[PDB]
Amino acid sequence: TLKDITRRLKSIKNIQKITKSMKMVAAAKYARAERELKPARIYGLGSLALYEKADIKGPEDKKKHLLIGVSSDRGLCGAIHSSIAKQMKSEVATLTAAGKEVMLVGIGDKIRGILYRTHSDQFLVAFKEVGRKPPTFGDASVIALELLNSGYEFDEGSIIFNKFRSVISYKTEEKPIFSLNTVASADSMSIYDDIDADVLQNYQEYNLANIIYYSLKESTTSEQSARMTAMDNASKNASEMIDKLTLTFNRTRQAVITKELIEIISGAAAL
Template sequence: MLSRTALFVPTCTQVRGMATLKEIRNRLKSVKNVQKITQSMKMVSAAKYARAERELKPSRPYGTGANVFYEKVDIEQDKEKPKHLVVTMGSDRGLCGAMNSNINKLLKNYVKDHADKEIKFITLGDKARQALYKTHSDYFMLTFANFGRQPATFADAADVAESIINSGYEFDVGEIHFNEFKSVVAYKLRPLPLHSLQSVSEADSLAVYDSLDAEVIRSYQEYQLASVLYACMKETNCCEHSARMTAMDSATKNAGEMIDKLTLTFNRTRQAVITRELIEIISGAAAL
């Protein structure tokens, strides 16, 4: 009798490869918490994006207007010259799509394509420094961080421009790379030429303007650089918030889909556990 009863002792061993109810419940709870966080970040980014977009339109003439003089003078850069300066605009924080990774990829490719040149980086946004400083530390000249926490002002751009001019690096070829805002879901990495004081002074068409002396050219150079940087900062700020808002919206939707799948798995597993326990109880009662 005892030996016969022992054959029907109910077991509670877990099937290999099958998650327990507790594991599924914990996973479901963590995904719901993540969804709340991404939802909150999306709302914050949406509010910041609305403000950044309002401030973007009046700031764009600063960049286009400041370059009119150089377009009239028709300054050409000789990229075969040895000294190159690359200024990039990124962000201090992540979770904003491919905005920062595109800049990091551009800097890496620039080093490969101009391996025989002396290259220096000036980065606005700490993400580029974090990603490349270990492998490209010799190329970094200046790094500016924490400028994107608050909406950029012309004073911020003037401080950056003054630091670049007072750095003492006499470059032959200069470029500014920033993300140009297109729409809520689209932005494009765009280059702008960065001219040194020497290249402007040596321009052939400059002789048309008789009243220009070295001091006037230097003053306009400082103002032009600050204006272009200001416009680029506004473009970058708007791209960052729109990209983060889009990324957090996608993350919230993905979390919702994962919650639905986990809920279905949890209900099926619970039903399977209940059914198995009923079978074990009935089998045990029948054995008695």
Template sequence: MMMQRTTLLLPMAIEATMLAQQQRGMATLKTISMRLKSVKNIQKITQSMKMVSAAKYARAERDLKAARPYGIGAQQFFEKTEIVPDEKAEPKKLFIAVTSDRGLCGAVHTGVARLIRGEMATEHANTKIFCVGDKSRAILARLYGKNILMVANEIGRLPPTFLDASKIAHEVLNTGYEYTEGKIVYNKFRSVVSYQCSTLPIYGGPTVEKSEKLATYDSLDSDVVKSYLEFSLASLIFYTMKEGACSEQSSRMTAMDNASKNAGEMIDKLTLTFNRTRQAVITRELIEIISGAAALT
């Protein structure tokens, strides 16, 4: 009786094993199909973002050519007056990190934050940071959150204007932090596939007034110097924001192009895996049908 029961149970076990194998094959096919569909959707998004970034880059490059005279004129003032910080006074430094609120553009924002981190590693007691864009704040707040003076948000969604730069310059000069010297850290556009993290020096009002060659610009009182410093700071911030916007769009265009190519390679691999798995499932099912038909004859 025991042998007879075993004989009866054996075909049922084989049938259950075959059914489990079929279910596993179908589950694998379904998983690969879902992954393939997901990667194809991602590729469509990256291709669309590349096209949008290409259009924005063309506009940003045109705007940058018009904004460069603002930066060059402001830099020449500091160069010709040969401003040097007072070594006897306690230095108070200020870093203005020019980034944006948007990502998916390679290491554009990371490079700015890395340069500031390197400067802050040596001395950060009397140093403050003004973040233009939320990306720099997110990176620098981990180590130097207490040194962040203020953050300017809503940067990068629209092309930067001189009004935006004027508002930032006004906030920098009215924070109550009397800095003696500082730097604007930004990305300088070089070509479609290249940019360089650069700095521009800035100086506070008392430091500028002590310059010996300030008389080159005729007699200037403190009110005139203060007004000009606000205008020159706004000009430098406007120029660096334009440089950063152009670098960001070109980097995003390159990043999205690379992402689209990677998605295409992944789609080819998943398609090949899907076809091989599907062929294996069909072959196994045919073998089971033939084996079952042969067992009945």
């Protein structure tokens, strides 16, 4: 039907236009969010050089556990919010099998709305408003507070985020988060001078806001590029669909004109 094909052509043309505009907007957002990753990757990575020079391994005997999945609120990114949830619930059962009680936290409405079905009681707290504005240290500092004002005596932790590598590809990654009783008991920390169990607490509480901030910068410059790619693919698919539907529309309009001609001619020749 000609009206059906016209409706569908108009619909998919609107879709293609909006998707191209969205791709260019996500490209404008990614160019910035990747310029602000170079100063936040020296800070964040310079915040974990100790735990690698001191070579903190972490205790495998403690049971309580924390698991941070970093994502955003907005979809249309692809496997961004799916790779995080894929990694979380993959190792939630891995630690639950060994008796290690795991309790989750969700940064971003997408990572919560996914795992809210299966693991909903194993969920300490969740957050919002991640993704609209570029993540700042004010956001990472807040998330660190309620991770301490929660009464969860977590003995080991890992934060899962999307490590950005290039515009084409990113990888999911988890960074370890050590508590006090493992960084104060490690016999490789005996060389560090003027250390008591309080100046380590202030140092473990700050290094929780860093590894969250370094995570929010990596998982937002890896999400805008993925949104750019996904909107590019969506606009391209809409374009090929528009091409096919325009071919079909031309065929149908020609058929309609010919049918009307044949009707008029058969009516005229029957007199």
